[PDB]
Design a protein around this ligand. Structure first.
Ligand SMILES: *C(=S)NCc1cccnc1
Ligand SMILES: *C(=S)NCc1cccnc1
Ligand code: NA
Ligand code: NA
Ligand code: NA
Ligand code: NA
Ligand code: NA
Ligand code: NA
Ligand code: NA
Ligand code: NA
Lengths: 305, 305
């Protein structure tokens, strides 16, 4: 019992973090096999970051200008390429701690753990979601760039996120591990609009199932609704529209609890229209949208890595 | 920018977790040097757990009845002793992954990371506090016993908590690593009263400093108060009384922000008396008490391990 925002155990990723320096910029990189991945903005000075010409800046650079360090272990860089907004530094040693891993581009609403790092060392680990508008609400200071987000499935690490920037509004943007930003962001210091954010409706519902499982049940009511009627209320409260695919993903939670999805929707409706009346659910006075249905099942059934 | 509930990176602890089986009970143990530590209730059957005579149960046991496994690696048990509510299994191999570590008994209000484990494998990591009443509000299923709580200071792991039980009320109790429970709890399945819990006032204040640092400043007001006047309001809202030691620990945050402790206290007062008016602070609609002043400084200044 209890329900917590829980990160994956981070040890498989801790052994892949390195420090990358170029000129006087230092940030973090990820060492997998004989390739180090890092944000291409490692090659930018202070000048350059309002309007960087990344092709031209990188031409000024040679393999020996990339100082890559793992612990005290210096690595030797024998190749460099830029893919989209990441740099790939070929080194002469395969990381002996490389886990089984793949690179995945996640969908808005999906969750992952972030290992926040400075100077190639881990400071902490936390779980968060890719917002509908492709930002993340992290905790990241100068020097945290190249910190990665990941999921773990037994022994397989799925890397989904590399951190690149803080927007003027205090939220965070970054790339997948092929260097394609999530969202409309670019790697320059400019005004950039994040969309309107929405609440992740399907995640909220999963979390209400988690609450019932744990004995928090006050919000359950004698009402039902329809998809279309629920969607009209989702509208007004800036919630993502709910689809049958979402209903279907909620099925195993529906079956465990005996509470039909559309009845849970009617509960949510009533919370959205009436607020929470100064009550809490699972220790929160807000509706929480950073657990997926997969997350709730994993936690409520005690899956290991 | 951003402020998150962040756990320590868990890799140093992941390499110490094992599985311990005795009869048909399996839980988790912690392998450090040539000693495995685990909850003594591993030797209990279903019968025994209403009223266990631990001395007599353990006498029925020999070294070879303790099956200790690390990965597929079986360990050989060459000695067993019970200290308070933990069992110490002497094994014939020193853990090659043993970090620098000590055992510490933390104070109510202090925080630590928990690596929740099943069958000696890590499922996840989360930060929490030792409540004033010596419980913790974890996320723990059957099989999670022996999961540990810890802090990290560079390369030194401080183990402070081993999980032993869930109370009938759904909160969690356990021991330090010498097997002394925190609080009045015992390791039997019985009605057990946790005290009245209090909010950790000094942690709330630290978190208000964190909010100001991050730009959430709406709650700041044109009032001040005194310790005694603040303490009268702490009373009524079941907040821990605030002492000069608490003021003094808040000093570096006071100095960074320019906001005198007692003025921050007057802000808190006004929040306690008026509630939050449907506003949020650092994404929360409640006052958060699971960051220490040390935690806020660490996060806001980007300390690594
Ligand atoms: C990273 S090394 N620099 C950009 C940055 C700064 C603050 C937060 N996130 C990204
Ligand atoms: C641990 S192996 N058994 C007791 C328990 C059960 C549920 C939660 N926490 C502790
Ligand atoms: Na970049
Ligand atoms: Na987020
Ligand atoms: Na992004
Ligand atoms: Na940038
Ligand atoms: Na015990
Ligand atoms: Na707690
Ligand atoms: Na306890
Ligand atoms: Na017990």
């Amino acid at each position: 019992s209890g329900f917590r925002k829980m990160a994956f155990p981070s040890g498989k990723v801790e052994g892949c973090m390195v420090q990358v320096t170029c000129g006087t910029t230092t940030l973090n990189g990820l060492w997998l096999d004989d390739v180090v991945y890092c944000p291409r903005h490692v090659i930018c000075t202070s000048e350059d970051m309002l309007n960087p010409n990344y092709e031209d800046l990188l031409i000024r650079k040679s393999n020996h200008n990339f100082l890559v360090q793992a612990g005290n272990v210096q690595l030797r860089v024998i190749g460099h390429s830029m893919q989209n907004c990441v740099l790939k530094l070929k080194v002469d040693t395969a990381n002996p701690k490389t886990p089984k891993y793949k690179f995945v581009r996640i969908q808005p609403g999906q969750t992952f753990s972030v290992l926040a790092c400075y100077n190639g060392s881990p400071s902490g680990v936390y779980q968060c979601a890719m917002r509908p508008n492709f930002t993340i609400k992290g905790s990241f200071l100068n020097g945290s760039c190249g910190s990665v987000g990941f999921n773990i499935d037994y022994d397989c690490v799925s890397f989904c996120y590399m951190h690149h920037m803080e927007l003027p509004t205090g939220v965070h943007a970054g790339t997948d591990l092929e260097g394609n930003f999530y969202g409309p962001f670019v790697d320059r210091q400019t005004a950039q609009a994040a969309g309107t954010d929405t609440t992740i409706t399907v995640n909220v519902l999963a979390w209400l199932y988690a609450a019932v499982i744990n004995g928090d049940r006050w919000f359950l009511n004698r009402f039902t609704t329809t998809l279309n009627d629920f969607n009209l209320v989702a509208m007004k409260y800036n919630y993502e529209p709910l689809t049958q695919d979402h209903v279907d993903i909620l099925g195993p939670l529906s079956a465990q609890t005996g509470i039909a999805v559309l009845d849970m929707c009617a509960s949510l409706k009533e919370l959205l229209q009436n607020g929470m009346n100064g009550r809490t659910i699972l220790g929160s006075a807000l509706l929480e949208d950073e657990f997926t249905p997969f997350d709730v099942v994993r936690q409520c059934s005690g899956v290991t890595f």
